[PDB]
């Protein structure tokens, strides 16, 4: 077992963590026990992997052994094993696969995935105009887009921003995210005893998911009725079709129950994540007009006025792609990614990690490597640009994590970020209330995810 601070009887290693910034806490601890150390929280023992070296040697090289999902008392209470985000064994590789392929640009019908995002970007811009250039909070708008995107990929179509169903869904998605991100929820995951004495909070979430899932099930039924085995409209159809195919083995991991959960998983996995990054991206663009202006020039060069942007233009716009990467590397949305777990006994280094041991990877240590990224604390699009000005990749770019568990929506997220942002910059100018040299882009890490400080900006139309 890897070294680490001795844990007290009931509070474990809690006194070693500054809840106001768990991420940072782990980094400081690595400055003592190295890139690999053990920790104890509640009844959960965990091994922290800090530093690119150990992170790659685990997620990549030893991919299969670290392909397991960390123990989640909360997730296992709400999903019970179903879904993608928290499934395992056969069940995981099963749903995962189908999801990966069904999500391919043309993995679910004649209509491509990009066509949906494109349309949403059209609405996103259409709504921004409504603000009439007046000071406003992009928090809401930037949230409807990513959410509506998933909706159009799961259901036959999207929803009007006014539609109540939509509002109920997003409002319910926010409450659920707040809950799970609270320090209290973190405590229950580790110590499942206290949750029985104070079920209140967990019940609210379970209730929200229950209602959310029911509404899904219903639509899943509306599909079954008008399904076209040879003309899939969305995820549901594909899944439903897949069922008909494996209607011969009683071991088919594909069931209506797994669909509902999976649908819910994706829905909650692509909203907050993408939404927060977009809102953070704009904030950074206000702080750095110099950078915003350049992107606009590249959009002006490679795209022009007569045409809206598309994914084919990304490979042509090296600078714009750099900013998108820098924004992700800088904000470090998920400091510690999602809890992992060794599928068996692994002799990582001199230390041996027992089967089923929770593994916490510090993506922060990778995305903020002072070496691969000089001055990782500063926002600079240069980090992903060579001397010539061409885009340069990096094995240190793991916002979506890495390994057999890498984000299922990595291609979808990047597609949205690029299109959404470029659409906005091509139609509007970014002017903030107070001076761009004043407002601070510093995060407010909630522990589970980083959140940008509150701010307001104005969307000034570019007519030409
Ligand atoms: C900019 C936004 C996003 C970021 C930064 C992000 C990041 C990540 C990360 C770090 C993980 C955990 C990987 C691990 O367990 O090692 C993950 C999981 C996942 N994400 Fe995303 N993600 C984003 C958007 C999306 C979107 C748009 C979708 C929906 C299609 C989505 C779907 C998922 C799913 C299904 C998983 C669980 C995968 C598995 O365990 O097999 N994500 N994401
Ligand atoms: C709590 C929870 C998180 C995620 C998920 O994909 C997220 C990940 C990996 O990071 C996030 C940051 C903000 C909001 C959601 C996520 C996915 C599910 C199914 C959950 O129950």
384 lines ligand 1 (CB under 6 A): no
Atom number in ligand 2 closest to CA 337: 9
Any idea what the CATH number is for the domain that residue 137 is in?
1.10.630.10
Atom number in ligand 1 closest to CA 404: 41
Tokens for 405, please give them.
Answer: 């568990």
**To test the ligand 1 pocket, which listed residue (67, 273, 279, 417) has its Cβ within 8 A of the most ligand atoms?**
273
CA distance 57 to 356: 18
Q: Which residues contact 368 (CB under 8 A, 6 or more apart)?
A: 329, 332, 376, 377
Q: How far is the CA of 92 from the centre of ligand 1 (A)?
A: 14
Side-chain half-sphere CA neighbours of 198 within 13 A:
9
322 lines ligand 1 (CB under 6 A): no
User: What are φ and ψ of residue 453, in 5° steps?
Assistant: -65, 150
216 lines ligand 1 (CB under 6 A): no
Atom number in ligand 2 closest to CA 276: 13
457: β partners: 136, 432
Which ligand is nearest the CA of 361, by number? 1
Which ligand is nearest the CA of 366, by number? 1
Q: Write the CA distances from 220 to 89, 94, 258, integer angstroms.
A: 26, 20, 12
DSSP state of 68: E
**Matching residue, tokens 């998108």:** 324
275 lines ligand 1 (CB under 6 A): no
DSSP state of 340: E
Indicate the resolution in Å.
Answer: 2.9
CA distance 220 to 241: 12
- Look at residues 272, 277, 213, 235 and name the one whose alpha carbon lies nearest to residue 151: 235
Instruction: Give the pocket of ligand 2 (CB within 6 Å).
Output: 75, 85, 177, 180, 265, 268-269, 272-273, 334, 338, 449
Q: How far is the CA of 409 from the centre of ligand 1 (A)?
A: 6
Range of the domain at 171: 1-464
- Look at residues 174, 255, 250 and name the one whose alpha carbon lies nearest to residue 220: 255
Q: How far is the CA of 461 from the centre of ligand 2 (A)?
A: 34
DSSP alpha helices (H): ranges in 18-112?
A: 22-33, 52-56, 75-78, 89-102
DSSP 10-28: TTBTGGG--GGGHHHHHHH
399 lines ligand 1 (CB under 6 A): yes
Q: How far is the CA of 107 from the centre of ligand 2 (A)?
A: 24
269 lines ligand 1 (CB under 6 A): yes
Determine which helix (DSSP H) or strand (DSSP E) holds 169, and give its type and residue range. helix 164-181
Work out whether the CA dihedral 380, 381, 383, 387 comes out positive or negative. negative
User: What are φ and ψ of residue 11, in 5° steps?
Assistant: -85, -5
Q: How far is the CA of 142 from the centre of ligand 2 (A)?
A: 17
Q: Which residues contact 386 (CB under 8 A, 6 or more apart)?
A: 392
Determine which helix (DSSP H) or strand (DSSP E) holds 361, and give its type and residue range. strand 358-361
Determine if residue 238 is labeled as part of a ligand binding site.
Answer: no
Q: How far is the CA of 76 from the centre of ligand 1 (A)?
A: 18
Residue 154: CB atoms within 10 Å: 21
CA distance 408 to 329: 18
Tokens for 195, please give them.
Answer: 């949750």
Atom number in ligand 2 closest to CA 333: 12
Which ligand is nearest the CA of 405, by number? 1
Total count of domains within the chain: 1
DSSP alpha helices (H): ranges in 227-360?
A: 235-245, 256-269, 272-287, 289-302, 318-331
- Look at residues 94, 139, 434, 138 and name the one whose alpha carbon lies nearest to residue 246: 94
**Matching residue, tokens 């869904």:** 169
DSSP state of 14: G
Name the experiment that determined this structure: X-ray
Classify strands 340-341 and 428-432 as parallel, antiparallel or unpaired: unpaired
CA distance 73 to 188: 8
Interhelix angle 235-245/141-154, nearest 10 degrees: 30
Q: Write the CA distances from 432 to 73, 128, 274, 436, 455, integer angstroms.
A: 43, 15, 22, 7, 9
**Matching residue, tokens 């399904």:** 227
Q: How far is the CA of 334 from the centre of ligand 2 (A)?
A: 9
270 lines ligand 1 (CB under 6 A): yes
User: What are φ and ψ of residue 391, in 5° steps?
Assistant: -70, 135
Side-chain half-sphere CA neighbours of 328 within 13 A:
23
Tokens for 391, please give them.
Answer: 């885009």
């Amino acid at each position: 077992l890897p070294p680490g601070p001795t844990p007290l009887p009931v509070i474990g290693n809690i006194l070693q963590i500054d809840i106001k910034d768990v991420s940072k806490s782990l980094t400081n601890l690595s400055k003592i026990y190295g890139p690999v150390f053990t920790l104890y929280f509640g009844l959960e023992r965990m091994v922290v992997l800090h530093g690119y070296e150990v992170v790659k040697e685990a997620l990549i090289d030893l991919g299969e052994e670290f392909s397991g999902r960390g123990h989640f008392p909360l997730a296992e209470r709400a999903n019970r094993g179903f879904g993608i985000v928290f499934s395992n064994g056969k069940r995981w590789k099963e749903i995962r696969r189908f999801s990966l392929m069904t999500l391919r640009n043309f993995g679910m019908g004649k209509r491509s995935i990009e066509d949906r995002v494109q349309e949403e970007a059209r609405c996103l811009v259409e709504e921004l105009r409504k603000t009439k250039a007046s000071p406003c909070d992009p928090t809401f708008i930037l949230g409807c887009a990513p959410c509506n995107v998933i909706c159009s990929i799961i259901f036959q179509k999207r929803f009007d921003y006014k539609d109540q169903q939509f509002l109920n869904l997003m409002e319910k998605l926010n409450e659920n995210i707040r809950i799970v991100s609270t320090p209290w929820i973190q405590i229950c995951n580790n110590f499942p005893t206290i949750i029985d004495y104070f079920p209140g909070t967990h019940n609210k979430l379970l209730k929200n998911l229950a209602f959310m899932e029911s509404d899904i099930l219903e639509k899943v039924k509306e599909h079954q009725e008008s399904m076209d085995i040879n003309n899939p409209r969305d995820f549901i159809d594909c899944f439903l079709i897949k069922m008909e195919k494996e209607k011969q083995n009683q071991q088919s991991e594909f069931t209506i129950e797994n669909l509902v959960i999976t649908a819910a998983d994706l829905l909650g996995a692509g909203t907050e994540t993408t939404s927060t990054t977009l809102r953070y991206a704009l904030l950074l663009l206000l702080k750095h007009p110099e950078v915003t202006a350049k992107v606009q020039e590249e959009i002006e060069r490679v795209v022009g006025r007569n045409r809206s942007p598309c994914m084919q233009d990304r490979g042509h716009m090296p600078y714009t792609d750099a900013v998108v990467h820098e924004v992700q590397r800088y904000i470090d949305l998920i400091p510690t990614s999602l809890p992992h777990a060794v599928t068996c006994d692994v002799k990582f280094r001199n230390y041996l990690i027992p089967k089923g041991t929770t593994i916490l990877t510090s993506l922060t240590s990778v995305l903020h490597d002072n070496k691969e990224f000089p001055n990782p604390e500063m926002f600079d699009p240069r980090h992903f640009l060579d001397e010539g000005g061409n885009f340069k990749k990096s094995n240190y770019f793991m916002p979506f994590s890495a390994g057999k568990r890498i984000c299922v929506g990595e291609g979808l997220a990047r597609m949205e970020l690029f299109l959404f942002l470029t659409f906005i910059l091509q139609n509007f100018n970014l002017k903030s209330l107070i001076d761009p040299k004043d407002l601070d882009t510093t995060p407010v890490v909630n522990g589970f995810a980083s959140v940008p400080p509150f701010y307001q900006l104005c969307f000034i139309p570019i007519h030409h």
